[PDB]
Structure formats: structure tokens, C-alpha cells
Design a protein around this ligand. Structure first.
Ligand SMILES: Nc1ncnc2c1ncn2[C@@H]1O[C@H](COP(=O)(O)CP(=O)(O)OP(=O)(O)O)[C@@H](O)[C@H]1O
Ligand SMILES: COc1ccc(C(=O)CSc2nc3c(=O)[nH]c(N)nc3[nH]2)cc1
Ligand SMILES: [Mg+2]
Ligand SMILES: [Mg+2]
Length: 159
């Protein structure tokens, strides 16, 4: 039996599209993970530290038998595979894999918050998330993604 989870992927260093593509393939190769839906890719202005490169962002749905901590390990291992060397949270990265939703579960461990606690004010998450999960309930707000998503001109269709 599998639980439905959603991941946010980002890249703003190098050949961003190729790195995201590789990330999806790698994620789909872990035992206990199947990629089951893929959002469109958006080009997005960097949020937070603005003196860094524009991002490509997408969301994916996965079906998984992994626990949320095992899932996190696989997310972090995927980043290592794509040669993420920088670990400054504010700084650029070859690949970022964030757990956005893990069924309707909520957790706020010192080093792990799901639903991702910043997702609701990030167009670069919500726009691609809405593309694939418009009717999914975000458990903190208890609103559907389609009732959270908002227009943002800094988020542009890429692919
Ligand atoms: N929902 C989540 N998904 C992935 N990592 C999370 C997380 N909640 C907390 N973390 C923590 O954040 C660490 C990963 O660091 P980074 O990826 O460098 C932060 P970031 O993705 O730039 O910021 P963001 O998570 O606000 O988008 C993980 O080692 C983990 O302990
Ligand atoms: C102080 O206010 C903030 C601090 C940090 C942030 C972050 O989002 C985390 S770093 C980061 N990740 C991405 C991303 O995937 N896509 C885009 N487009 N921009 C990003 N920036 C936002 C606001
Ligand atoms: Mg991250
Ligand atoms: Mg992130």
C-alpha cells in the first residue's frame, strides 16, 4: 500500500532542466518510490536572496511506501547525486528536493516540517502544485491548493 506525496524541485545552477530531469529519473529509481504525476516546469525569479540565478521549479506527485524520514533521506541523497555542494540555505543550488505534502499528515520536528511550512506564500511552489494537485487539501490551512494558489508575474511558463 502506497501513500501519495508531493515534492517540490528547484535548480538555479548550470543546466537546470537536465538536472531536474535527472532528479526525476533518480527519484523514480529508489525502491519504495514511484513518480506518478509531473507538473509543468516554470522559470522563477529567486525569492529571498535575489543576487543569485533564476530558478527552474516544478512539483511531482509520488506514490511511496517509505516513511517521511526515509523519503527525506532519498531527497537529500538525490541532491548529492546532482552534486549539490553549496549548503547555504539562502544560496544557489544545482538541485533542491523539498517534501511539500505527505498525505494529509502534519509534522513539525526541529529539522522537518511537513506540509512544507513556507509553501503557502510561494508562487513557485503553488502554481506548479495547483497544476497537478488543485483539489488536494493542504492540512495546515485545510484549504484546497486551488484555494491557495495566486497570480505571480515572476513565475513564467518554461516547459
Ligand atoms: N519539508 C521539507 N523538505 C525537505 N527538507 C526539509 C523540510 N523541512 C525541513 N527540512 C530541512 O531542511 C534541510 C535541507 O536544507 P535546504 O534544502 O538547504 C533548505 P531550502 O530548500 O533552501 O529552503 P526551503 O526548505 O524553505 O525551501 C533538510 O536537511 C531538512 O532537515
Ligand atoms: C527571506 O525570505 C525568503 C527566504 C528564502 C526563501 C526561499 O524560497 C528559499 S531559497 C529559494 N528557493 C527557491 C526556489 O526553489 N525557487 C525560487 N524561485 N526562489 C527560491 N529561493 C524565500 C523567501
Ligand atoms: Mg530544500
Ligand atoms: Mg527549498
Amino acid at each position: 500500500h502506497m501513500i501519495q506525496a508531493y515534492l517540490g524541485l528547484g535548480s538555479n545552477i548550470g543546466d537546470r532542466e537536465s538536472q531536474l530531469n535527472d532528479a526525476i529519473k533518480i527519484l523514480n529509481e529508489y525502491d519504495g518510490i514511484s513518480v506518478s504525476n509531473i507538473s509543468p516546469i516554470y522559470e522563477t525569479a529567486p525569492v529571498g536572496y535575489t543576487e543569485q540565478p533564476n530558478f527552474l521549479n516544478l512539483c511531482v506527485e509520488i506514490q511511496t511506501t517509505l516513511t517521511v524520514l526515509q523519503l527525506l533521506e532519498c531527497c537529500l541523497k538525490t541532491e548529492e547525486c546532482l552534486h549539490r555542494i553549496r549548503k547555504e540555505r539562502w544560496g544557489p543550488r544545482t538541485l533542491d528536493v523539498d517534501i511539500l505534502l505527505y498525505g494529509e499528515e502534519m509534522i513539525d520536528l526541529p529539522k522537518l516540517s511537513v506540509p512544507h511550512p513556507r509553501m503557502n506564500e510561494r508562487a513557485f511552489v503553488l502554481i506548479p502544485l495547483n497544476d497537478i494537485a488543485a483539489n488536494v487539501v493542504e492540512p495546515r490551512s485545510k484549504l484546497k491548493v486551488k484555494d491557495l494558489v495566486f497570480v505571480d508575474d515572476s513565475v513564467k511558463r518554461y516547459k
